[model samples]
Target chain A: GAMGSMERASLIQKAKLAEQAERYEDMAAFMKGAVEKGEELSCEERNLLSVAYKNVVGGQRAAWRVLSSIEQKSNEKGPEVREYREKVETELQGVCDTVLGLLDSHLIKEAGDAESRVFYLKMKGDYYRYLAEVATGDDKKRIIDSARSAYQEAMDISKKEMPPTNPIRLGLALNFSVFHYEIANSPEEAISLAKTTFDEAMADLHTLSEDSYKDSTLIMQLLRDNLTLWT
Target chain B: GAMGSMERASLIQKAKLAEQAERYEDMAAFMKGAVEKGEELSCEERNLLSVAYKNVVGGQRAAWRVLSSIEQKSNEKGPEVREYREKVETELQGVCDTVLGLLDSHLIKEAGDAESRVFYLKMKGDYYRYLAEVATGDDKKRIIDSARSAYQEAMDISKKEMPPTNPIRLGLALNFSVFHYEIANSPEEAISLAKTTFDEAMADLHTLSEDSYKDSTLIMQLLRDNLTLWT
Candidate 1:
């Protein structure tokens, strides 16, 4: 009475599409419905859906719910579903830990990647920006220090491996521009850093392929517009 | 010219369904259409959709494409969007770091709360399982040891405060059952450990509320059934 593998695959495909379309609530509902379509689904389908629900849709709440449900179902029948639930539970737990570990390691390594490093540094800067906006006591200073450390690390890494004209370098510089203009309360420094980063980005574009250059130019313009806001 | 909030919400709901169905291609199409329509959407609608699109969609390729298009429409720009994105990104990153830090500190903390600790420990267990299945040599051993340590920590904490009948203890026992069962190359040891854990869980169930007992019984049964697989 199992559903054909192809039919299951099609159902999975639809579920994935729903997720991609930013319809998380719907995706959860659909998968739940799919499982209710009798016991025709192979054990694989049930396992996969269980995971997707716990992860993609359910988040923390769903994870707890699924765990609780699996526990109940196992007590009801001492058979295949019970066995499968245990395996899935272990696997899910393992995968989630691995992800967390990777994220931790990544944050450390990203301190070294020139381009991607800016994303994190910018994040730090934004933190300080919030603290300053709220006029919270020492919190602003603490966040600013964190931001500086991240930015300084990125700058040091960039200076060694990345050329002066790299897009990542430009991005970092633009970030500096914003920090100086907005956070440091120094527009002069912001304008100076913005101009330098912009020039470097433009200079690099000349030597690059047209396609790459066009993209770089757009980014440069974004930075420029951001700087203009301060003016 | 903007669409009403109701219309936008409906579109987003449909998009969620498409994503859940794993129709990435369709999801992409839907997002593109939404972005186009976003031009006429109120600032709030645009902001909501933008955040949803960023989080729900898979693969950066599609995200960049949509962002690139949005960047081109200057008329719909809002300063608040830029500020919000920067603020959220930084706050989210900080939260991520805080979560990681808590995990690290928990490993060392003597004053442990089982209910609270189980969540992260469960995540650690999952991480190790993945590494055991995929990693080779030192990395594999390292991940596994870390997982084992986390599981042991959870067990220790659970045993210290409440009796074995506590929900946290039961939960940890279920997790341990799954962990040892999967990684134990010796089927006999797996069965032995699983059986012990299952027994402990059942004994503990009597201490809990009817609802809690029902849940624990389910996990205990699942573990019991899984052990039978190897027997």
Candidate 2:
């Protein structure tokens, strides 16, 4: 039994190292091993492994290519590469549109369930954040406001009977802080609100278990650091 | 020059360690020294240092408590320590609540800015996600549907004039995919849409310089991985 636990722990460490190294393929493999040797793992480990697989494998491929390209180029490029890149880029866009089409259809057809609903809210919140980041003029304002509204709606419904300290609730709070900090332009107001958001998030940290609190604290610290820029 | 760089790097690493160790008093002092000694350090470094100091000294005391509580018994109590913890927690919550209250006010006040508008959408989106996770009966369906509609609205606005391969657009697409996959329970559809989103995101990546493309590729890769999950 001790050996089994030790093996599982080693596997987890390996998986984490792969993740940190950005060797996702390796991470996936290690996770699979962990899953197959599941007897030694806890429920939390199982859940996390599942999420890691889902997150890494379930999304799009071209998106990764784009990200890689960005990091490699550091925003500079030769004309030839740029042109070919454009063509590939268009294909990527088409892919996104198609995916959106399918998602929309699913939402329309499905009667709806708890899981489905959360997906929808998350999509909306994320989309709004994207829009806010890119939009100029009146459009930017519109997008940001919409994102705030969507997050609030999700929170309201989620809060009805759930414990105040659910991970979902904590996530929502974190997002709220991020968006608020991003959109605030006034030096005084931005600094003040950033500090306030960080503090509020810390207060809620009590609701989480120790491990969860550790994770939440990392994010809180990040926010605090980001807000300090304005100050 | 190499030696100087190494020394500076060491100092930075030490500062980070102090931060992670919850030695706020020492972190503040360490950062101050690093900033003063490193003539080549940029504005960003100074800014980060300043913020770190403010966070340690200000509302972040509660965050420190959360960090310190790690590896300690959750319910263990000493009268003096308990009282101090309670005071910190309350103060933190009060500040946080103030921030949330301000966010509520901002939603109403800055309804015009695009940035402001997106915040509203994100808030509602989060609310809906929470609802989907926990709500029962008719309320669940209604909330989910509302979330979908809001997302669609945000998407419409996002696509209207978005640059073909923008990260913001890509992020929006990814959000949509997340919704379909997690909350909506439509893995196939999420995958399909996520692909399209990734493609488009890549197209934008092409427009950037090679250096930028490197960074962009990471996002593309992430999208690709997301798609792989369903397959």
Candidate 3:
């Protein structure tokens, strides 16, 4: 009962249906099966993996945000609120660790080229950033460091290989800057990074290819938006 | 010059493509034509219409949030930032008005059943809430009033016709309570409304239909969640 081509393809198809039905946990399970097979993921399959994990983790993150906010604001619920918050954090850490496992074990090694590498690296950064939000003490410091390294490595690769107008490259810049501002708590660095990225992209706007026009332009707008807001 | 079934079907198809491409404005334009044909919308078609306008207005609302926050914090940006904010507001107002137009002129009148009516009224309230977020003085008060009235009507209708475990009914309660807490600034009302909805739905848990089991339970969780957070 190993997954052959037929079984793997079926799992992927089921994953698509799960996503459409908004059963993201099932979606993640299906894709996780496919990913663990050590098969190099196609572009669509990688994105499905990302989407599934993101939605699942996103739900927990949102729950934590609301719960933690209430805990801070009320400061009166005592052990009950603390226990529920701990439960949510446990669930959140589980999902983040799972995605990180898949990334380092399979997806990262499978990345053959610049785009794929950048995407996985950026995603690695993203999940760590999510973990950083909820982590505490030494665990929090380690997660934050992991996040920064992943982002910086992705940024370095993207800047060297990909065009400034490449959507993935622009997205890396956008998220990396966001990390600086939010997680790193350095608005000055965030503004500088966003401004440079936006300016470079603007200078290269004329070189934008037809297929990437929409996405590249959107990211550029966001970069400019951050600059405007930060300044 | 006239759209036959084939032409209308083609437009709908194109709307799907636009949505897939994240060209929400184009999607809106395509769906707007299909909606304006005065033919009754299928559930999927009505949802497409909602998705289009929501994405379009949602973008502007986010932009406004960022811009306004920065404007308040900096207090240094003068007429230029103000002018851009006005521009975003104008565009936001236009899209909101257009959706409201479609809702009043077509969607509302065409809603023959309880579910459809509740869905449209909740959406109507949602758009007004979005407007209320950006509005000031008399405009803000009036928009808030419209939002409250729409939510109230939807809540009243759903409570009478739909089961406590119906997703639509539960969702109306959820959003209406959110409006009370956030826009109406009545945490007491919000907490009370959410608690009542959750308790009623919990009592009817055994009666939850198979089809609505997923969505209804999820919303019930959210209602309980609001209670936990609000209280």
Candidate 4:
């Protein structure tokens, strides 16, 4: 902490200044901190913060998460929400393609540790998985295969080098199941992958404090939702 | 000012919370006071404020003036700027129509004095004239005529009621010429308006102190820029 802690508004202002200066990486880092320490931001604030995230992250995934939130708050039913929805749709394809390119290039050209390499591969799979949503015929199958291959690499790395209790491993386990289901249209594969991941997550939950239990339960319910959909 | 002066952020957050609570009129009023008392805001902050202005204003012309401030500093380059520009363009028309609708309903549906009538009509003219940048053919021409008539009503009121050296009359005279330039595409009209408004403002300037004269000179130079552009 080289700088003292600031009020949420002050930090937000600093983030804005950083953004104006085109120090995007610094701006993203500050936004991350602001959200972590601050209370829940409004849809507009989240939209701005997502733009902040988009600046430095190649995936633009963080931004989509924020943009997606405005949709969830559909009750706003006004001109701004209409604009917000339009923005997300306009940028969705561009963001997906650009982020995919970056991930692909990084895997081919860069050097990194096992964890870093695996993480990128997982993201690549997720990108393809998302893209497959809009694809058809040969295009859909090819995209799904790409997703499976990327997730396969991530899983291989996780199983060999990391312990079972690792968070990334858990995330990977769940994400990979969806990749399997989407690519092959195999409900069994999805069900089997989801079941193990949930069990592992449950085993790990005993180590965490009770306060985090609510979050775990929420995730478990989501996982259950996925499992039920598969079955 | 019964409400104490607030930091730009606290009030901004308060405005968002007010909006979330569906107290939109209160949101607009708070935003107005927020900008007046707070320090000059960042562009991001301004963008948020403009949206606040849009959401709740019974008179949205005030909001557009706040929104229009963005174009003043466009040199800041990068993706965020591009996105911000896109956002401004997408909503520009919706903001215009919605604000106009509110004004039409408000003007016909309420009561006000000579000053209130002139004040709103002038703002109405400014607002419509502002939208001409993105409009087309008959749409553009029609919008300009509406602006002209609105300004006509305002000028008539100012001449009939407000005394000489009145700020409203000076503002009406100067803005009306810019209206002619945009609506009619005539350099001569803009030049003629510029020259007289400068003189009127200059003669009026003697009543003020040294500090305000410098400010007046700055505004006169803005008028000068408009004249130079026309010439």
The top-ranked prediction according to lDDT is 3
What lDDT score is found at residue B132 in candidate 2?
A: 53
User: Native-contact fraction for each model?
Assistant: 0.00, 0.00, 0.00, 0.00
How high is each candidate's TM-score? 0.30, 0.30, 0.50, 0.40
Specify the CAPRI tier of model 1.
incorrect
Task: Provide backbone clash counts, one per model.
Answer: 30, 137, 0, 0
Relative to the unseen true structure, what is the C-alpha lDDT of residue A125 in candidate 1, on a scale of 0 to 100?
A: 49
Instruction: Name model 3 segments beyond 4 Å from true.
Output: A1-6, B1-231
> Against the true structure, whose DockQ is highest?
4
- Give one digit per residue, the lDDT tens place, for model 4 in B1-231: 433655555666656644554445545555655655634444444445445644533233333343334444755433443443343445566656644654564442224556566656776776687677556788888987888888888888878887545555666677888877866687687788778777766656668556445555566777788887777
Which sections of candidate 4 miss by over 4 Å? Answer: A1-91, A107-110, A113-115, A209-218, B1-231
State interface RMSD in Å for all models: 15.1, 16.7, 22.0, 14.0
Identify the CAPRI category of the predicted complex in candidate 2: incorrect
Residue A188 lDDT in model 4? 85
Winning model by TM-score: 3
lDDT of each residue in A137-214, candidate 1, tens digit only: 686676556556666676676667777666566566777677777676778978877777777666556686554566
Which ranges in model 1 have alpha carbons more than 4 Å from their true place? A1-231, B1-102, B105-108, B184-186, B204-208
- The per-candidate TM-score of the B chain, in the order shown, comes to 0.50, 0.49, 0.90, 0.58
RMSD of candidate 3 to the true fold? 22.4
